[PDB]
Amino acid sequence: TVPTEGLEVTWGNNEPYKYWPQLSTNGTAHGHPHEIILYYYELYPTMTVVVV
Amino acid sequence: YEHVTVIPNTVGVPYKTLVNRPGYSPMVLEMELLSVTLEPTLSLDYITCEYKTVIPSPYVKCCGTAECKDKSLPDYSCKVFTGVYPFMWGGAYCFCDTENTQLSEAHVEKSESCKTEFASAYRAHTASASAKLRVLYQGNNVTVSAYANGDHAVTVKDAKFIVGPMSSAWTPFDNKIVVYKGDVYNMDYPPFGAGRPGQFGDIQSRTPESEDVYANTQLVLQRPSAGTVHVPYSQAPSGFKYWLKERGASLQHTAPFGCQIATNPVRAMNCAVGNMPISIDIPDAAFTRVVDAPSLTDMSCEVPACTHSSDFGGVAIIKYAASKKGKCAVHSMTNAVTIREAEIEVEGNSQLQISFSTALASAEFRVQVCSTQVHCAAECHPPKDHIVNYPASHTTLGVQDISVTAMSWVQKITGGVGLVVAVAALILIVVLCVSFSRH
Amino acid sequence: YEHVTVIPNTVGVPYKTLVNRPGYSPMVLEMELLSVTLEPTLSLDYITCEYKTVIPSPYVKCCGTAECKDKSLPDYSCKVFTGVYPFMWGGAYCFCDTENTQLSEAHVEKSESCKTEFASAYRAHTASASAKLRVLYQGNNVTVSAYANGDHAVTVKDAKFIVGPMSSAWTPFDNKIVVYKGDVYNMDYPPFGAGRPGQFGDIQSRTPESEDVYANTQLVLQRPSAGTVHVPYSQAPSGFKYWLKERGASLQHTAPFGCQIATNPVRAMNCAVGNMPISIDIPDAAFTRVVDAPSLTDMSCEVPACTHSSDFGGVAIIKYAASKKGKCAVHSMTNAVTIREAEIEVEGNSQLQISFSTALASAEFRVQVCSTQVHCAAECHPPKDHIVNYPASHTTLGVQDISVTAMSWVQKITGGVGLVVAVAALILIVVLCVSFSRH
Numbered sequence: 001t002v003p004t005e006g007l008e009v010t011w012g013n014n015e016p017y018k019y020w021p022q023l024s025t026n027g028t029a030h031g032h033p034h035e036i037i038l039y040y041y042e043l044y045p046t047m048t049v050v051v052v
Numbered sequence: 053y054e055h056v057t058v059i060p061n062t063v064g065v066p067y068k069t070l071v072n073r074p075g076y077s078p079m080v081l082e083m084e085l086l087s088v089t090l091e092p093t094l095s096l097d098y099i100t101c102e103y104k105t106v107i108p109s110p111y112v113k114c115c116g117t118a119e120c121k122d123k124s125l126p127d128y129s130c131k132v133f134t135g136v137y138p139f140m141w142g143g144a145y146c147f148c149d150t151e152n153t154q155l156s157e158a159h160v161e162k163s164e165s166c167k168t169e170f171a172s173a174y175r176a177h178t179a180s181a182s183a184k185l186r187v188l189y190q191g192n193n194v195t196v197s198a199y200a201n202g203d204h205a206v207t208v209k210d211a212k213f214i215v216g217p218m219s220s221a222w223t224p225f226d227n228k229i230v231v232y233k234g235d236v237y238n239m240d241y242p243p244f245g246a247g248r249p250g251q252f253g254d255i256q257s258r259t260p261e262s263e264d265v266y267a268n269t270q271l272v273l274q275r276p277s278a279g280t281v282h283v284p285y286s287q288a289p290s291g292f293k294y295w296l297k298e299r300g301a302s303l304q305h306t307a308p309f310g311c312q313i314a315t316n317p318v319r320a321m322n323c324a325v326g327n328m329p330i331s332i333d334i335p336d337a338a339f340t341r342v343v344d345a346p347s348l349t350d351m352s353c354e355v356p357a358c359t360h361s362s363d364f365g366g367v368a369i370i371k372y373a374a375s376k377k378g379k380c381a382v383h384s385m386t387n388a389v390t391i392r393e394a395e396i397e398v399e400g401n402s403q404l405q406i407s408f409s410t411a412l413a414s415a416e417f418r419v420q421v422c423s424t425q426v427h428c429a430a431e432c433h434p435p436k437d438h439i440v441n442y443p444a445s446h447t448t449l450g451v452q453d454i455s456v457t458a459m460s461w462v463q464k465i466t467g468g469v470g471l472v473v474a475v476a477a478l479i480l481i482v483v484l485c486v487s488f489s490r491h
Numbered sequence: 492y493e494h495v496t497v498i499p500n501t502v503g504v505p506y507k508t509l510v511n512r513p514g515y516s517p518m519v520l521e522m523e524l525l526s527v528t529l530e531p532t533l534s535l536d537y538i539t540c541e542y543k544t545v546i547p548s549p550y551v552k553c554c555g556t557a558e559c560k561d562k563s564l565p566d567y568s569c570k571v572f573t574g575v576y577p578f579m580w581g582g583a584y585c586f587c588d589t590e591n592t593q594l595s596e597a598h599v600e601k602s603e604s605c606k607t608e609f610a611s612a613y614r615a616h617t618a619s620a621s622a623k624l625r626v627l628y629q630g631n632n633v634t635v636s637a638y639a640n641g642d643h644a645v646t647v648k649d650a651k652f653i654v655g656p657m658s659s660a661w662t663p664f665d666n667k668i669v670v671y672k673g674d675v676y677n678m679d680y681p682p683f684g685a686g687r688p689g690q691f692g693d694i695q696s697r698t699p700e701s702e703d704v705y706a707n708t709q710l711v712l713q714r715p716s717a718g719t720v721h722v723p724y725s726q727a728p729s730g731f732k733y734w735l736k737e738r739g740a741s742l743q744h745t746a747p748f749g750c751q752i753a754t755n756p757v758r759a760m761n762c763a764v765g766n767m768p769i770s771i772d773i774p775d776a777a778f779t780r781v782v783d784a785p786s787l788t789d790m791s792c793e794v795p796a797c798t799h800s801s802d803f804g805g806v807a808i809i810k811y812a813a814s815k816k817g818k819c820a821v822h823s824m825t826n827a828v829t830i831r832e833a834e835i836e837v838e839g840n841s842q843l844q845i846s847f848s849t850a851l852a853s854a855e856f857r858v859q860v861c862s863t864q865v866h867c868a869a870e871c872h873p874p875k876d877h878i879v880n881y882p883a884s885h886t887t888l889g890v891q892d893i894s895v896t897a898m899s900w901v902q903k904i905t906g907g908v909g910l911v912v913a914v915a916a917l918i919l920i921v922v923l924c925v926s927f928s929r930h
């Protein structure tokens with residue numbers, strides 16, 4: 001997995017393949033129910049959702 | 053401006069700073085960090101390299117008992133073995149029969165392989181911070197390596213900058229650190245004179261050219277068995293072979309923040325931590341009045357399409373009817389969206405395309421296009437691609453971002469909530485008036 | 492066998508220790524600290540040497556004007572004065588008179604004294620300790636230097652000298668230190684680049700070989716007097732012209748606790764503060780059996796004159812009954828009184844005569860006379876000496892100090908004089924029985 005800072009992987013003498021985390025986060029909608037705490041399930045999962 | 057800002061300590065992020073000089077032409081400038089060089093205290097303590105178990109030539113006292121010659125040698129050891137037998141080409145090396153004794157001695161010294169290859173027990177603390185920086189000012193990509201501590205002022209084409217100091221003074225180095233030809237390790241090497249035998253670091257001299265070696269190698273000279281002429285001993289634990297077996301977790305690869313090491317002298321390279329203040333100076337020579345700047349009328353920014361992401365996360369067309377011709381700036385005022393190209397040209401009744409990036413879903417945008425403040429609204433998109441190499445710090449937001457409709461759902465649900473305390477106040481005033489009117 | 496002691500950190504005062512293995516006759520040995528030299532770890536920030544103001548032969552542009560070239564020199568300065576009057580041996584120098592202008596230039600660079608005569612602003616750091624120790628090893632003085640950190644083990648003549656730690660932690664130096672050629676000064680210089688004219692930092696260079704000379708002179712030129720073929724410049728006071736004459740009290744003189752400074756390299760010697768432990772292990776080659784000693788009996792101490800002083804506090808006679816001839820130890824059971832005699836050869840049933848030294852008003856104490864016990868008493872007298880050139884940690888005390896007989900004067904006045912309050916206490920039960928005199 002990737003943290004928020006990202007991972008730099010390194011393989012042999014070759015280049016350190018850094019990765020920066022893509023914030024893709026697309027499993028939500030707006031709809032007739034809420035689906036915006038679904039956005040907050042994507043962005044910051046499991047925290048800032050206990051607050052509501 | 054004497055514009056002193058604090059840019060985040062990120063190598064390769066174009067910081068777009070705003071110069072709205074008072075009643076002057078607006079001017080957006082680019083900066084880009086290129087190196088973060090941190091160099092700690094160069095305090096070499098002592099050395100450790102290979103030794104040499106020095107065995108001198110044995111001393112066979114033929115028909116006689118040799119006695120111990122005390123020689124002040126490191127790990128000196130001597131013993132005269134009694135009842136030996138020597139032999140050579142033509143039988144016995146001695147005419148003597150059974151009173152053949154044989155003196156035998158050995159010791160330890162430094163090795164000559166410490167000519168260039170050795171290990172440096174070494175001390176280090178607070179680094180001398182220096183950094184590389186390229187400023188794009190009006191098509192001028194000037195660059196400068198300055199001391200990142202707030203002491204080294206530098207002017208280039210009259211543009212004045214005092215850089216630094218460093219905000220987070222975090223250090224990846226211990227005091228007692230040992231140095232190999234490309235590496236450094238945080239490890240308590242044993243102190244001088246008080247070193248442990250057989251451990252990596254028993255061999256201890258002060259400078260690499262110093263030969264005064266304290267070492268404990270434990271040469272217990274064995275007896276050569278029967279008639280064979282050699283000098284067996286208790287075996288010598290060579291620390292310097294398995295010094296290199298415990299390279300392992302290299303400080304190049306164990307540093308946080310993506311820090312890089314490069315020894316001799318020891319560079320803590322590119323710490324992605326904190327931020328950095330910087331003074332920004334230029335005179336009014338590139339600054340005409342706001343009316344002498346081309347004043348934009350008919351201003352309208354509109355986002356046709358945006359997928360808010362680490363790429364070019366959006367684009368917007370601005371239609372305008374400016375006053376006149378001029379290379380004038382463009383500054384996004386809302387901090388998430390940042391303008392990709394700091395200054396544009398304007399002529400009058402025209403329109404042009406800007407590109408930018410953010411992460412707000414319902415993106416609000418406000419811009420200083422060199423005369424005027426123009427608002428844009430948007431509904432951008434979260435990305436669907438997966439691999440992005442490079443960061444995007446400008447897209448990032450805090451813990452509070454707007455919804456698309458759920459602000460209204462909040463003040464629908466956190467809307468009428470004091471109606472219950474309103475009728476509770478009704479309860480309180482009716483109980484007060486009946487309790488007081490009756491008593 | 493093993494013998495760990497913590498002697499006080501005293502430069503140049505001996506220490507007697509009662510070394511003894513379990514089972515044999517005791518011994519008293521002398522050790523002595525000679526020097527505690529604290530070497531600070533260093534780094535040069537930048538240096539300062541004398542500058543040199545250099546002019547060209549200036550340009551006498553007769554009949555016209557020729558503008559100079561805007562070169563980049565440390566305090567480059569240029570001015571083409573107008574209407575000048577060049578003069579030489581045959582009257583005026585140029586036949587053209589009125590349209591004579593004169594370019595003039597001036598700059599400042601290093602001087603030639605910077606090869607060996609220059610001060611240096613250093614960044615000082617943590618200090619490294621070093622110590623000197625001479626032990627009178629049974630009538631044999633042997634001396635060795637070490638680190639006084641608990642971390643420097645040396646062994647020679649069966650003396651496993653390992654010190655304990657520097658119990659203090661204080662260094663007499665701040666990072667901002669300057670040094671010139673015989674001395675150092677702890678003041679805050681301006682850093683490199685950010686120097687001030689007419690001070691430290693009037694001219695700034697990192698190394699003498701570093702050619703970045705941060706200069707601050709403001710040598711503004713003037714029109715010459717009347718046709719005079721020369722260039723006048725303005726005021727520029729320096730630092731070398733003033734502060735070398737008023738650096739004043741070097742850190743040799745500013746030193747607390749009696750520190751001393753010493754260059755090449757600079758180091759803080761001989762402020763013995765704190766308490767230094769030493770662990771020393773000695774085998775049974777020194778200890779001899781108590782049957783090889785005489786059993787001293789019927790000891791009685793008689794002090795004809797004691798005087799609580801810094802020097803030889805008193806003299807005593809020990810009536811002793813040694814059983815035979817033999818060498819044995821004498822050691823008082825308190826640290827306050829110090830017999831100057833350590834290992835005494837005794838012969839029989841007679842009176843030996845020794846000295847001692849304390850500042851106790853009456854030295855009442857006990858001495859292990861070679862595994863036998865004597866109790867000693869000495870009415871000491873007021874010290875008639877006045878000034879002493881050496882300090883006296885042998886006669887030193889704490890605060891729990893004992894008088895001649897004034898503690899018995901207290902015992903007179905505290906055989907409690909509050910026993911009348913005990914009379915008041917014993918009538919408590921009778922007044923309570925008056926309360927009980929009915930019921």
Ligand SMILES: *[C@@H]1O[C@H](CO)[C@@H](O)[C@H](O)[C@H]1NC(C)=O
Pocket residue numbers: 066082083084186188193
């Ligand atoms: C100038 O710098 C910017 C950002 O630092 C970079 O994108 C651009 O390619 C540079 N141009 C030249 C000519 O170096």
Ligand SMILES: *[C@@H]1O[C@H](CO)[C@@H](O)[C@H](O)[C@H]1NC(C)=O
Pocket residue numbers: 505521523625626627631632
């Ligand atoms: C040995 O040292 C003691 C004190 O440590 C000193 O008084 C004495 O003179 C020294 N003797 C010799 C022979 O060095």
